[PDB]
Amino acid sequence: LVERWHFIMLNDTKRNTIYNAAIQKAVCLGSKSVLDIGAGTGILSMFAKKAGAHSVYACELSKTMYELACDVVAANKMEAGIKLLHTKSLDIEIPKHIPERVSLVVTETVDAGLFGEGIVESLIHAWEHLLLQPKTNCEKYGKVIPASAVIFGMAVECAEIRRHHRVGIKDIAGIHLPTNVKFQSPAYEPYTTEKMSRVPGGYLALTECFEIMTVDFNNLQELKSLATKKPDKIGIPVIKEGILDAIMVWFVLQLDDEHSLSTSPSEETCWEQAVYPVQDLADYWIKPGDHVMMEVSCQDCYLRIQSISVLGLEQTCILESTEIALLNNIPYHEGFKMAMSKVLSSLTPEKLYNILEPFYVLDVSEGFSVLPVIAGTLGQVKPYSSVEKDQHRIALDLISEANHFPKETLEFWLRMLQRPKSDKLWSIIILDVIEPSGLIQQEIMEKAAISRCLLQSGGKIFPQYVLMFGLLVESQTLLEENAVQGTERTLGLNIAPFINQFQVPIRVFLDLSSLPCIPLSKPVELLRLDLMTPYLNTSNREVKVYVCKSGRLTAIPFWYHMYLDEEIRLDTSSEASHWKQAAVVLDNPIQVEMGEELVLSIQHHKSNVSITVK
Ligand SMILES: CCc1ccncc1CNCCCCSC[C@H]1O[C@@H](n2ccc3c(N)ncnc32)[C@H](O)[C@@H]1O
């Protein structure tokens, strides 16, 4: 309900201090009438009032955030001086919502790409309807904090970004990906966002930092012009050999002459960068002498970088990032090849590489999957794909052709779980068990139980079972993302007890490998989800975890080993995993001692798992 950024930004003392100092300066120079656009909990509005502003107006788009801001403003005894408005800034009218035009607008409607929260649209409206005229004293003319911003770019090598946007291989577990199928991510999604200061495997600067654009938030003509301004065509010198994976983008906010904020990548700051993946080139290798060329525009809200190309000295298949990461997950496909060949082998080795009767193999993977083609290559197999999108069907037809399938070897199941034919049964059913989120898929136990009945004698659900592993960690990061840590970070203002009512018990879409934390235990098996034998499912159980190290336990990250058979397991935490992980974050951190035996109480019901300290 409450975006994680509200917790991180409220816990950033440095940022609170700098916004307070800028709002203080402006108010005491006589900006005593303030509109806070995107107020969240209302901390900037409370800075303005306490700085001596006469009237403060705070608008917030989210019902949840507006109600929270009402509660926080009241709790800090500022109900009377601060008018909270449940409204998009665009829908503020004078005198209906605000009595008079205001001397100061403060806005934190800002994303990693600066523009992605509609600031340009808001400030154009603000200048036109809501602000006093600009300077041609301070009580008599309109001004905006932030005043202006410089946007910076850098060409980078980053395999972690690459593996989500480009398919890196021509051959997966003995199937050929044909040249005549081009895979593109959806960023070909104007950008992704990334804490680049700790992206798994890091990044390499291939160019110097280069200025992309400047913006003056106090110049209405300039903001009005962005909409129709001709894209800047630019060309950036290469200073290092490497693979061109992305343009990394950040910015400096000038709040006023003396106060600025940088979203430059750093472990010292909370800020993320905008990331523009590079794809649909013949070659990605760049070296000193080359230029990185691109068009930069800001016409329809977002900063777009397009036509990214390298100046030196054919069916398209759109995949989600998860599906691109999947095709780049080699051990996943090699596991399936091996484990499928073993199940085929132990049921009819004669049909592995009644003659007319194949192995029937059903793939119920959620999205795009090449498992059926891999199954196809193993023996006399009739493989079934569960792809819905026409584009996926065409790609798989073309991949089939490239691996010497006769036409209509690969069948499409959608074009309910049922028998393959009237009096026939499945040799393998593949179920999708774990969400990209790192949570167990809903209704999986139902799908398993239905699927069990539809199997040939000695046939298998893949995976047969799944072990969930956990780790005791001390993570201040996970804590500061989860909960405001008291009053001192918000400069005495009392916000934590109100926002912390919206603590999430579980952080999903977590990159474990990147996480700054201290391990307090070794991995430990937390529960078994067994698709072949439901009786082995952990109902409710306690787990004794040996504490290897003294620390403040804040979280229990968790991932899965998915067993295709007893020898072959997939790791959702693997380097190349197309799954994210998750973590239980404690409402209250617990202190643990080396030698202690901590008890986790683990409640499991369907696809939901409670994990608690006892
Ligand atoms: C330095 C920024 C940064 C840089 C790098 N990495 C991360 C960040 C952090 N950015 C967090 C985005 C937070 C989301 S926007 C903040 C609040 O404003 C609200 N809103 C949005 C538009 C809007 C409107 N026109 N009228 C009223 N309210 C509005 C949202 O409902 C939200 O509560």
Swiss-Prot record:
Gene Ontology CC annotation, any one: cytoplasm
Keyword Methyltransferase annotated: yes
pH dependence remark: Optimum pH is between 7.5 and 8.0.
One MF term in the entry's GO annotations: protein-arginine omega-N symmetric methyltransferase activity
A biological-process GO annotation: methylation
Chain ranges of the SAM-dependent MTase PRMT-type domain: 1-305, 329-614
Primary location group: cytoplasm
Keyword list, A-Z: Cytoplasm, Methyltransferase, Repeat, S-adenosyl-L-methionine, TPR repeat, Transferase
Protein's cellular compartments: Cytoplasm
Keyword Ribonucleoprotein included in the entry's annotation: no
Temperature-related behavior of activity: Optimum temperature is 37 degrees Celsius.
Superkingdom assignment: Eukaryota
Effect of residue 113 to E: Abolishes enzymatic activity
EC number: 2.1.1.320
Assembly behavior: Found in a complex with PRMT9, SF3B2 and SF3B4. Interacts with SF3B2.
Family: Belongs to the class I-like SAM-binding methyltransferase superfamily. Protein arginine N-methyltransferase family.
Function: Arginine methyltransferase that can both catalyze the formation of omega-N monomethylarginine (MMA) and symmetrical dimethylarginine (sDMA). Specifically mediates the symmetrical dimethylation of SF3B2. Involved in the regulation of alternative splicing of pre-mRNA.
Protein name: Protein arginine N-methyltransferase 9
Organism: Homo sapiens (Human)
